[PDB]
Amino acid sequence: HSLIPVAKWFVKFITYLTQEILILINDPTNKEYTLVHGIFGAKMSRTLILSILNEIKKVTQIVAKFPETSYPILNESSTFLKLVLSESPVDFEKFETFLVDVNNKFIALCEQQPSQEREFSLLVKAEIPPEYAKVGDFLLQYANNAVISHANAAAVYFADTSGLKISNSEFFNPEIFHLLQPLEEGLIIDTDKLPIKNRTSKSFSKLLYDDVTCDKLSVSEISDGKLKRCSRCGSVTRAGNIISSDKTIVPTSIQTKRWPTMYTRLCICSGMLFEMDG
Amino acid sequence: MDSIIPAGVKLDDLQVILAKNENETRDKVCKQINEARDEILPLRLQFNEFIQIMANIDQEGSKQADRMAKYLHIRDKILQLNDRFQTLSSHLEALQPLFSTVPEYLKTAD
Amino acid sequence: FRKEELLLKDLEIRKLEISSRFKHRQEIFKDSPMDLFMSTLGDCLGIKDEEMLTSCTIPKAVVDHINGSGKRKPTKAAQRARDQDSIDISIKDNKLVMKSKFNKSNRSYSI
Amino acid sequence: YKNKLTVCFDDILKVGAEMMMQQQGFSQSQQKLLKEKVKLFHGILDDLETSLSQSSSYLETLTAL
Amino acid sequence: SNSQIRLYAKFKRNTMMIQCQIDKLYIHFVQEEPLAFYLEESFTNLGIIVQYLTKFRQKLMQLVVLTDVVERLHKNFESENFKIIALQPNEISFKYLSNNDEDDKDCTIKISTNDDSIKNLTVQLSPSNPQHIIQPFLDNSKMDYHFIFSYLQFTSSLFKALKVILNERGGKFHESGSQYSTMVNIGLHNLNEYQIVYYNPQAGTKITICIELKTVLHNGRDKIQFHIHFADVAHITTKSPAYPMMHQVRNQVFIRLGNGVACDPSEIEPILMEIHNILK
């Protein structure tokens, strides 16, 4: 049951990259949307998603092979897992072949001309060197006919993929998201110089969504003071604590240690997690 | 109600009848088409209001008697909806003999 | 741990009761979409059938046959059929009666 | 047009019949079915209004002629 | 001797609303200081002071709310066509479109004032103004006046373009026997969309163009753009007699994703004419 909130962000993520495919075709000269090139260029990411799609098929096959029979009421979580995959706006099988074909084309190009900077460019720079300008044109042309032909073009463009918490501008509050002191004064800032409403860790970030299980944060979980913040990336998560009964399959007082207990002390970015002050 | 235009009468006979009587039936049919035109819009407005009520069913509800009142109200709403459907059916069937000449005129002019 | 067992048993009984409920409802009031809508919506609210009002009147033949207390005796096959069904169904004065067989308390059906 | 207006309001309840059946989240197919039903109801209302206006104009022009 | 009361008052700032005609209040501005003005009454017995004071208080609340409305409009209607024609205590006659007529009020706003603010701001639109087709929806919906002003400023260019389109067909006899079988009329669903359908009774064909207000995510922010596109019903095959012109429009147009065309309102009026260039 607890995997369902994670899967919502999993589907919400693949739609953002597919949305950028349609936008980039009309205007290939827009430099502000060059992030789409690097994401597909990463070599392990294409394999990593394929592995995720592989285990998703294995899990669904195993669940179909070994369903829950003693209690039909408990089949909702298993059934919902099948439904969310089929009801996705873009078919996973069509998207699976999309990344597979990119890997093969990007391997033959290495044999055509030996180069090691392109591996760095596709992973870190998220750009294509000017000497390989012809390679960039291939991504625009081929992506249109491959997967979009089997999906709703109008729906994906207007789909609500906002709130992905990808950019830093939507992590910290807009009041403090700017340079506060000149470079001569240094980079570290004493707390006393912060604005009065911005002198606490509660006002530093957007405390709306969770970062580990990708679930919406209710008012009860905000006010209990049991949530944690990362001192490195500004992430906020209530991991490592017992979840409320309303988030369980059935409201009950039984305490169960959920998977968020892995990140009790270490954040996702190897940063330290601390109890958020109230 | 009243059948000003007899059934089964030809178009030319209706033209001859219409040419006289100082257009009392013309006034009646003009009033009928005017009220149909002025009725078309309020039906759309109240239908949109019903859609808005249905969409906002999960708001402004805290007591069970509130549900009694609201759903009695909506059942009454569709009650006058069916009543208005019957009234517009009567209006169109009243003008049905008048409209019956149009197919004959079109097929003769073909 | 009998508490969770009885909760899940009650949930299964509820879902089968709802199944029988709508399969019977779709045929008893097939002629009136208004009546079906308002009946299922009121039962989603949790309204007892003795309080809500009906616009149309049902025939009395089904009322006589469902109980059989009239001149025609109920069929023994009909008795077995109503025994195998999970809901006791009968109509009193143009209105049917619905009562839970396991829980006699005010089972709220509201969402 | 007489039958279309009757069935459309019967179908909007029929389209919802399966919507509250599961209720007795929301499926995207049912939501888009409701959307297309309401938009076609509006469209046929507009078409009937245009037909009424054209028939009326024909009425005055034939009466004048 | 003159049996009159004048209540002189003065504005704290050079408010541009003083340039507008406020004669239909029966207020007089002072000649020697243009920020000063008086309210006026006439009396019998003088002792019933409350009648003149309450009428002055009412006229002063009316003026204050009118000034607030004018300031909000100036904040929201920053355009070169914005101008006030006639000033009245009970109605507003201002021009914000490109209508050439001086005395023709593009938008009429009726003033219904209460003890503290305007009870309701009803928007009335001139019949010559092409915006009059949205009048019933504005009347029956109690939306925010600022939101109504925002919608009007956002859709003014669309209104001008559709005005040109409808005036193309509405032209008088040009001594040409080109009795076109296509008539242009406006279809309306609600305030969120405006629809244009081309009636051809001779050919028995329809040309539907729907313009909806759909939100799209842009750089982490949601924006509203006009969704000019053919409806999903318009899955017209190659066999339709009228299909050539839809196919030409699709080939020459279909931000294009194949079906929809989202456009900036500052650029809708040239591109719509580009669509209308094929139509005309």
UniProtKB/Swiss-Prot annotation, chain A:
Modified how: Phosphorylated by KIN28.
Intrachain disulfide bonds: none
Cellular localisation: Nucleus
Motif Nuclear localization signal per record, residues: 193-197
Family in the record: Belongs to the Mediator complex subunit 16 family.
Task of the protein: Component of the Mediator complex, a coactivator involved in the regulated transcription of nearly all RNA polymerase II-dependent genes. Mediator functions as a bridge to convey information from gene-specific regulatory proteins to the basal RNA polymerase II transcription machinery. The Mediator complex, having a compact conformation in its free form, is recruited to promoters by direct interactions with regulatory proteins and serves for the assembly of a functional preinitiation complex with RNA polymerase II and the general transcription factors.
Other remarks on this protein: Present with 1720 molecules/cell in log phase SD medium.
Name of the protein in its database record: Mediator of RNA polymerase II transcription subunit 16
Lineage, top ranks: Eukaryota, Fungi, Dikarya, Ascomycota, Saccharomycotina
Section of the entire sequence shown: 697 to 974 of 974
UniProtKB/Swiss-Prot annotation, chain B:
Residues recorded as bearing N-acetylmethionine in the entry: 1
Localization, UniProt: Nucleus
Similarity-based family: Belongs to the mediator complex subunit 3 family.
Subunit description: Component of the Mediator complex, which is composed of at least 21 subunits that form three structurally distinct submodules. The Mediator head module contains MED6, MED8, MED11, SRB4/MED17, SRB5/MED18, ROX3/MED19, SRB2/MED20 and SRB6/MED22, the middle module contains MED1, MED4, NUT1/MED5, MED7, CSE2/MED9, NUT2/MED10, SRB7/MED21 and SOH1/MED31, and the tail module contains MED2, PGD1/MED3, RGR1/MED14, GAL11/MED15 and SIN4/MED16. The head and the middle modules interact directly with RNA polymerase II, whereas the elongated tail module interacts with gene-specific regulatory proteins.
Stated role: Component of the Mediator complex, a coactivator involved in the regulated transcription of nearly all RNA polymerase II-dependent genes. Mediator functions as a bridge to convey information from gene-specific regulatory proteins to the basal RNA polymerase II transcription machinery. The Mediator complex, having a compact conformation in its free form, is recruited to promoters by direct interactions with regulatory proteins and serves for the assembly of a functional preinitiation complex with RNA polymerase II and the general transcription factors.
From Swiss-Prot, chain C:
Effect of gene knockout: Sensitive to amino acid starvation. Normal GCN4 protein level during amino acid starvation.
Cell compartments where the protein resides: Nucleus
Coiled-coil ranges per UniProt: none
Signal peptide (residue range): none
Note: Present with 606 molecules/cell in log phase SD medium.
Family from the record: Belongs to the Mediator complex subunit 15 family.
Main function: Component of the Mediator complex, a coactivator involved in the regulated transcription of nearly all RNA polymerase II-dependent genes. Mediator functions as a bridge to convey information from gene-specific regulatory proteins to the basal RNA polymerase II transcription machinery. The Mediator complex, having a compact conformation in its free form, is recruited to promoters by direct interactions with regulatory proteins and serves for the assembly of a functional pre-initiation complex with RNA polymerase II and the general transcription factors.
Name of this chain's protein: Mediator of RNA polymerase II transcription subunit 15
Source species: Saccharomyces cerevisiae (strain ATCC 204508 / S288c) (Baker's yeast)
Curated annotation (Swiss-Prot), chain D:
Superkingdom of the organism of origin: Eukaryota
Compartmental location: Nucleus
Subunit details: Component of the Mediator complex, which is composed of at least 21 subunits that form three structurally distinct submodules. The Mediator head module contains MED6, MED8, MED11, SRB4/MED17, SRB5/MED18, ROX3/MED19, SRB2/MED20 and SRB6/MED22, the middle module contains MED1, MED4, NUT1/MED5, MED7, CSE2/MED9, NUT2/MED10, SRB7/MED21 and SOH1/MED31, and the tail module contains MED2, PGD1/MED3, RGR1/MED14, GAL11/MED15 and SIN4/MED16. The head and the middle modules interact directly with RNA polymerase II, whereas the elongated tail module interacts with gene-specific regulatory proteins.
Note: Present with 10785 molecules/cell in log phase SD medium.
Function statement: Component of the Mediator complex, a coactivator involved in the regulated transcription of nearly all RNA polymerase II-dependent genes. Mediator functions as a bridge to convey information from gene-specific regulatory proteins to the basal RNA polymerase II transcription machinery. The Mediator complex, having a compact conformation in its free form, is recruited to promoters by direct interactions with regulatory proteins and serves for the assembly of a functional preinitiation complex with RNA polymerase II and the general transcription factors.
